[PDB]
């Protein structure tokens, strides 16, 4: 039951926004990924998943923007 936020790499920011995904609802992952951005203020950064198990659902899609502070996915290990 392990849940996936955010950090604030930088100072507080208030704001998630995701542009490119590297995982899909219903298929496995490996504790070797990345290929997913996360967009803060106006910057693209890249940080590798040092997580795998099972995808059970998507609660977020692309092109949405939320304030920081909740989980982007549920999953189970």
Same mark, same amino acid.
Do not use: A
């Given at each position: 039951? $392990?849940?996936? +936020?955010? &950090?604030?790499? #930088?100072? #507080? /920011? @208030?704001? #998630? ?6 995982? +899909? ?10 290929? %997913? =951005?996360?967009? @803060?203020?106006? %910057?693209? %950064? ?9 995808? %059970? +659902?998507?609660? $977020?899609? =692309? #092109?949405? /923007?939320? &304030?920081?502070?909740? @989980?982007?996915?549920?999953?189970? @290990?």
């Amino acid at each position: 039951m $392990y849940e996936f +936020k955010l &950090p604030d790499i #930088g100072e #507080g /920011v @208030t704001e #998630g926004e995701i542009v490119r995904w590297d995982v +899909k609802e219903g298929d496995m992952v490996e504790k070797d990924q990345d290929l %997913v =951005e996360v967009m @803060t203020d106006k %910057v693209t %950064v890249k940080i590798p998943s040092p997580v795998r198990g099972k995808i %059970v +659902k998507i609660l $977020y899609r =692309e #092109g949405q /923007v939320v &304030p920081v502070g909740s @989980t982007l996915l549920q999953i189970d @290990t």
